Amino acid sequence: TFKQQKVEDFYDIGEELGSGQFAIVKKCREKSTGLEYAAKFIKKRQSRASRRGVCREEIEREVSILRQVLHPNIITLHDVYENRTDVVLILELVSGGELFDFLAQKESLSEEEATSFIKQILDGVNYLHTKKIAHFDLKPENIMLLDKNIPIPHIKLIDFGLAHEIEDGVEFKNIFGTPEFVAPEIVNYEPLGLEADMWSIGVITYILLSGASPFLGDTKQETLANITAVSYDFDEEFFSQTSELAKDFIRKLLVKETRKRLTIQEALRHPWITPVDTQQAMVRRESVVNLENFKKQYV
Amino acid sequence: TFKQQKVEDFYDIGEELGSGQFAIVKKCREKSTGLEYAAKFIKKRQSRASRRGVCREEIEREVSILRQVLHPNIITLHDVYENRTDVVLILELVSGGELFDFLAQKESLSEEEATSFIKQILDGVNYLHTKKIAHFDLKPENIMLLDKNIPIPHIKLIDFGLAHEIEDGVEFKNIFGTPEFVAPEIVNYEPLGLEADMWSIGVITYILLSGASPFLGDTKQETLANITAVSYDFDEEFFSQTSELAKDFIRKLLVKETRKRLTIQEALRHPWITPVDTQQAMVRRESVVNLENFKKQYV
Ligand SMILES: Nc1ncnc2c1ncn2[C@@H]1O[C@H](COP(=O)(O)O)[C@@H](O)[C@H]1O
Ligand SMILES: Nc1ncnc2c1ncn2[C@@H]1O[C@H](COP(=O)(O)O)[C@@H](O)[C@H]1O
Ligand SMILES: [Ca+2]
Numbered sequence: 001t002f003k004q005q006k007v008e009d010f011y012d013i014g015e016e017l018g019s020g021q022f023a024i025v026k027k028c029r030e031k032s033t034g035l036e037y038a039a040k041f042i043k044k045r046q047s048r049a050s051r052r053g054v055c056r057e058e059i060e061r062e063v064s065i066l067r068q069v070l071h072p073n074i075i076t077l078h079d080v081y082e083n084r085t086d087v088v089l090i091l092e093l094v095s096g097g098e099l100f101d102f103l104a105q106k107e108s109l110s111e112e113e114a115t116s117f118i119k120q121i122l123d124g125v126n127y128l129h130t131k132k133i134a135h136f137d138l139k140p141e142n143i144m145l146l147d148k149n150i151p152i153p154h155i156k157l158i159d160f161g162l163a164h165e166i167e168d169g170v171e172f173k174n175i176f177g178t179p180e181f182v183a184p185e186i187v188n189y190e191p192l193g194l195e196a197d198m199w200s201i202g203v204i205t206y207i208l209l210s211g212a213s214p215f216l217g218d219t220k221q222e223t224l225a226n227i228t229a230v231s232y233d234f235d236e237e238f239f240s241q242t243s244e245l246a247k248d249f250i251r252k253l254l255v256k257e258t259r260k261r262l263t264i265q266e267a268l269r270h271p272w273i274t275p276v277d278t279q280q281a282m283v284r285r286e287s288v289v290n291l292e293n294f295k296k297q298y299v
Numbered sequence: 300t301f302k303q304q305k306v307e308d309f310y311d312i313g314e315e316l317g318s319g320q321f322a323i324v325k326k327c328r329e330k331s332t333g334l335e336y337a338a339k340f341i342k343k344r345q346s347r348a349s350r351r352g353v354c355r356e357e358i359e360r361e362v363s364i365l366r367q368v369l370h371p372n373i374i375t376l377h378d379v380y381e382n383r384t385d386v387v388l389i390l391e392l393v394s395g396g397e398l399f400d401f402l403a404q405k406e407s408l409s410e411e412e413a414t415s416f417i418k419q420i421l422d423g424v425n426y427l428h429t430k431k432i433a434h435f436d437l438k439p440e441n442i443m444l445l446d447k448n449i450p451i452p453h454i455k456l457i458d459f460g461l462a463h464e465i466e467d468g469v470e471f472k473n474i475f476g477t478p479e480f481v482a483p484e485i486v487n488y489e490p491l492g493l494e495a496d497m498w499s500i501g502v503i504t505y506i507l508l509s510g511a512s513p514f515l516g517d518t519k520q521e522t523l524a525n526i527t528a529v530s531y532d533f534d535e536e537f538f539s540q541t542s543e544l545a546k547d548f549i550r551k552l553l554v555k556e557t558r559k560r561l562t563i564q565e566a567l568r569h570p571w572i573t574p575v576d577t578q579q580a581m582v583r584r585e586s587v588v589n590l591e592n593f594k595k596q597y598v
Contacts, residue, residue: 220475221472
């Protein structure tokens with residue numbers, strides 16, 4: 001249940017850190033402990049027909065999920081307050097910005113370094129999937145870093161606004177997500193599960209390695225058609241330096257049939273992520289990433 | 300071609316009329332004639348990946364369709380300007396706000412009066428469909444009034460951002476529109492055509508008469524489920540004064556099978572809209588819109 005108290009009685013509310021549809025995030029400091037957090041103010045929907053704000057039931061669902069998750073690569077919920085207009089999530093403060101913005105200012109990136117970031121994502125997703133929680137909004141802007149000024153920045157997955165607990169024998173279908181990153185079952189309005197997350201990881205990896213996006217077309221119409229046709233390529237212009245193992249990883253994630261798509265456990269065990277011998281570890285270490293196109297696309 | 304000139308050089312730009320995704324619409328007056336228009340400032344997309352702006356092709360499509368339409372119940376296009384950030388559509392000014400807001404201030408409303416407004420909409424849609432143009436965004440906010448201060452205001456359909464010319468043999472699929480008003484073929488990502496407009500008219504009619512919404516659930520997920528199941532009723536709480544003629548009209552529009560749904564021509568010739576005898580005309584005259592519920596829902 002949400003605390004029916006004024007958050008500003010308990011926290012000093014500071015500068016705005018970011019925003020999204022429905023939400024404004026401000027830095028804050030809890031008065032009694034002096035510890036800092038991010039306060040995410042979520043505007044409640046006031047009527048069923050309104051397209052503004054979030055339905056309080058859906059906010060409750062996000063909170064229910066967040067309260068269950070404690071893992072180094074997943075944002076940690078601290079508290080929840082409510083007033084007339086907003087539900088306020090007090091979240092672990094993540095100060096390192098978005099992963100992509102960090103990689104975009106980067107000078108040099110090998111596939112070994114790339115997989116270390118991807119593996120952090122896989123660890124977080126694995127933890128969620130074990131608890132039968134689908135994130136359903138895996139995309140660059142929801143992959144943040146605790147501190148961008150350390151040798152190996154530490155990934156935190158945020159934004160559980162679309163997250164859902166998948167129940168066996170209960171069908172879940174909905175239309176949501178950013179076209180560039182949604183799986184074919186989302187576009188086709190077919191039953192949804194943990195597999196959509198794995199497709200998204202395939203897309204994020206593809207972009208991370210090449211700067212290009214596998215299904216993105218001139219228009220949303222084209223993007224959606226491309227996704228449902230699973231029409232993509234590894235254009236040599238952008239993938240000339242990419243290892244076959246990296247491509248194999250992506251190929252096994254960008255698969256229409258949900259049953260055949262890699263599961264999170266299989267992804268974690270794929271040789272690209274977890275080499276089984278020195279020979280593979282070298283190939284990965286020597287494969288250099290395409291920061292030219294990536295920067296063009298994300299700067 | 301868009302005029303590569305500063306719209307401000309030729310128009311005095313006045314107060315805001317409304318806004319949308321990457322569009323802001325303002326009153327304006329052309330200096331050379333003193334005539335008033337609405338200027339729709341569409342923000343152009345900068346990269347194929349942004350969730351911001353509108354790409355060249357889609358702006359062009361909207362202009363191309365607007366150029367073709369000249370009908371009393373559809374806004375007319377006057378001119379098009381372009382600068383570095385925006386394409387500006389100079390459109391016929393519609394000053395009387397939205398139809399529903401006008402009906403919501405009404406004391407009393409019979410089905411006869413109601414059908415005369417609905418017939419204005421049908422006339423506009425009939426004109427588009429004859430040119431094989433689907434509007435694809437028929438909903439209350441896009442049904443406006445030229446002048447809300449005359450006894451029986453004239454309807455103008457606006458917002459052709461989703462409009463599309465339907466080509467024989469060429470499949471068109473896309474994901475768009477407001478959940479409450481989209482047809483099952485939109486939700487299911489199946490081939491689209493002129494029929495989607497007809498479903499929307501069914502929903503608009505249902506709400507106009509009763510104040511209730513046929514498929515609206517507590518959440519978007521529910522709404523979409525209701526739509527694809529065509530799960531709706533004529534709850535006597537709201538429809539106890541509505542004619543069987545009106546309900547028949549709605550039943551024939553809210554049909555999943557696109558080939559079975561009324562066409563615009565058939566809707567214009569449905570006896571609720573165009574009675575074939577004196578008796579039907581009386582029934583319509585003796586049936587009443589549920590203004591009580593309508594007002595409740597539209598405030
Ligand atoms: N826990 C957090 N710590 C710091 N900044 C955040 C946090 N959550 C969200 N933000 C900021 O708010 C933006 C929108 O967050 P969201 O709507 O959850 O994706 C992010 O892109 C960040 O800039
Ligand atoms: N021709 C017009 N005259 C007056 N208001 C308009 C006109 N076109 C659009 N608007 C307003 O601006 C909003 C956004 O327009 P649009 O992006 O075409 O949907 C609409 O919902 C109306 O409130
Ligand atoms: Ca489908």
